Amino acid sequence: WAPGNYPSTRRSDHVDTYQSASKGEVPVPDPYQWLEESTDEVDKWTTAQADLAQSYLDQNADIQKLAEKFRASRNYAKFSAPTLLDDGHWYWFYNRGLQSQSVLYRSKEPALPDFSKGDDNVGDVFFDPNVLAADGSAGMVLCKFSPDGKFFAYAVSHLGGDYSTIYVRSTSSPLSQASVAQGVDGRLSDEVKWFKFSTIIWTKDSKGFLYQRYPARERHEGSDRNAMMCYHKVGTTQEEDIIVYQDNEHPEWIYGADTSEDGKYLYLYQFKDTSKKNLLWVAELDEDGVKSGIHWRKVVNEYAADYNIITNHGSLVYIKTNLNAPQYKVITIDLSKDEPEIRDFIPEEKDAKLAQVNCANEEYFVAIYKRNVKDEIYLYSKAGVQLTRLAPDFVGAASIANRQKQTHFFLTLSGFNTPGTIARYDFTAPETQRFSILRTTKVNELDPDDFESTQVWYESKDGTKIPMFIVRHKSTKFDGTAAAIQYGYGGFATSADPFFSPIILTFLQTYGAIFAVPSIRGGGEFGEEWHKGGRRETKVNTFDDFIAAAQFLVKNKYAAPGKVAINGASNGGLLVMGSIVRAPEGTFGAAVPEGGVADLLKFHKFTGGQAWISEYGNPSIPEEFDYIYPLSPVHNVRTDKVMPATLITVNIGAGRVVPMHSFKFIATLQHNVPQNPHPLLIKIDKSWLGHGMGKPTDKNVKDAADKWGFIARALGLELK
Amino acid sequence: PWTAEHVDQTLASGNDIC
């Protein structure tokens, strides 16, 4: 590769006209409009680009070395929390280390295993999703056991497919290499097609489950509208499924459900966009079970807040909500009254987000609070008294795993240097012996104790103080010499939580680099106001926050000048692409946007773009075009600014941002600064991933070595 | 999906399966 050696990219005469509130009609040339299409010409162009990128990476002999180190760092057994089913047996996922899909195991004995003996010594395979297809083209993307433990419902996606299909099997019928060689699959004939974008919710009689589906679509027919919440009865075909709810007048809205443990209530959630606002309707179930013509009580019938059911006791329903409470709280709504009475059960904390609440042991509550972007776990009594903090020395991210009716619960704990701890709380144990560690994840080659994470605060352009995690190998100094990889997402109220990555830690140890995770506005770290601080008309703050983080790393000698690289995916790819356009020349030394939005004027004209109007605004509204257009990366590339080395990565598939965003952005970079001194490249994986499907592990390792090696070489880092 | 493609998800994959 050399500057100016990019594939020829045709420029059309296409112009789109938009209406600006401040400037009236604005004509916007779109010379790469044709990259919106799927054609021979586009295939040759993406092939030329991917060949150019691979040619450049081929010049870098260190990538293969990183692949070896990265594969080894991933090669350690991994496992989930176990779940006790009503058959008395415990089920958990187990991965031998490098398997592409983890395998669902079942305890040999009706007792909690001593997992120190080894998963294969205490459990047998129950469901191995690797055998769904002999060539790995099918993945299990969601599953749910029935409450009585007799059935296992599982959603399957295929390469090339745009929906998932739900299947059902008896829990006494394993799916394994042995079972498929020795006989038929063993599942029921049920085949529930057209499923996507909800969970699977069993009724508590275990007769069936609720799931969202879309209209059947022929190959050359006509978009994803007219979602329906449906009910599937086990042992029937889908033509007998009941439509529980649809709304022809609002064909864009989607649906969720929940069922109360006591069998009394069916709950319906409705969502009109990606804001955290939903309707909440409540139906009473009887002997008649789930039926068409269900009567809904429209308890929450305006879009104003997030409501998610926790549990109920009789007609008193406990709900996690952010109604008038942007850090969230628990309310009760008493349905015994004509006008429901609404009360705070666990009040909002001004400065800590209530992130999750589960009912445990029938009448207790386990709450996770996120304070300064670090999770804290507490146990509450039925009277709302905070009893104890669990795992008080844990620093990182926590989740709860339990079933409300049982006498125990688990916590799953991980963080930058905590690979994966599963703790157990046993209410039947003596009062000082209730909390224990069930399993700790043991990693390979790496020693997590060799790494430190800390949290520092910097100031954004408008004065706002923003926290940022910094992770380093403990021999790395903050003396103005390290490289930094700065990661972000920056949207949709998603929190940039601690997480464990053996590949990142291996990179940090290999090169003496640091990893930086700033909690930029648009995320949900500090509740819904933090999200509102970076969305629609304030979305510019997300970019200012991310740019100020990189400037702070260099100014305060965490990292060397010009040695901050940035990386992010989906919304985080938009973050990366807009950041390199907006920041002063030299702010970044490398950039890897993964599958981002980049045409912020046309994003809502494609597939899943409409739902994002709540996050970015609507380009077709003149007042909103005026704040979108200055931020749109495709429309703000200059000719006078040196760009960092950039490797754009694109994965094709269901539910992913359409790739024309990345295509237009890289075509526009190579048109505007063809002689850039640093390579501006794009790598496309043309396999069509189905919904929820990942790539095989070996491809993931190869892609990681390419990405991190590209960054290392761009920043001048050498293998010691 | 905060870290959905970048890290193995086995640890939390059992939290809500019944």
Residue numbers in the entry:
A (entry chain A): 6 to 227, 230 to 727
B (entry chain C): 8 to 25
Copy text from the publication:
GmPOPB is the macrocyclase responsible for macrocyclization of amatoxins, eight amino-acid ribosomal peptides with the core sequence IWGIGC(N/D)P. Amatoxins are cyclic peptides further modified by a characteristic sulfoxide cross-link between tryptophan and a cysteine, and hydroxylation (the extent of which vary). GmPOPB is an unusual enzyme catalyzing, depending on substrate length, proteolysis, or macrocyclization using the same catalytic machinery. The protein contains two domains as observed in other POP enzymes. The domain containing the putative catalytic residues (Ser577, Asp661, His698) comprises residues 1–81 and 450–728, and the other domain is a seven bladed β-propeller, comprising residues 82–449.
In order to obtain co-complexes, we mutated each residue of the presumed catalytic triad (mutants S577A, D661A, and H698A) to ensure inactive protein. Crystals were obtained for the 35mer complex for S577A and H698A; with the 25mer substrate S577A and D661A. In all 35mer and 25mer complexes, the enzyme adopts the same “closed” conformation in which the lid (the propeller domain) sits on top of the catalytic domain. In both 25mer complexes the N-terminal residues of the substrate (IWGIGCN) are disordered; in the S577A–35mer complex the N-terminal two residues (MF) are missing, while in the H698A complex only the first N-terminal residue is absent. There are also no major differences between the H698A–35mer and S577A–35mer complexes, and between the S577A–25mer and D661A–25mer complexes. The oxyanion-stabilizing Tyr496 is in close proximity to the core proline (P8) in the 25mer structure (D661A mutant), while Tyr496 hydrogen bonds with P18 in the 35mer complex. Substrate residues I11–P18 (the core peptide is not seen in the 25mer, apart from weak density from P8 in the D661A–25mer complex) form a twisted loop, which makes contacts with the protein and within itself; atoms that will ultimately form the macrocycle are 7.6 Å apart. To confirm the importance of the putative catalytic triad for GmPOPB, the mutants S577A, D661A, and H698A were evaluated for activity, and were inactive with both 25mer and 35mer substrates, using 5 μM GmPOPB and monitoring the reaction progress after 24 h. The recognition tail adopts an identical distorted 310 helix conformation inserted into the middle of the β-propeller domain in both the 25mer and 35mer complexes.
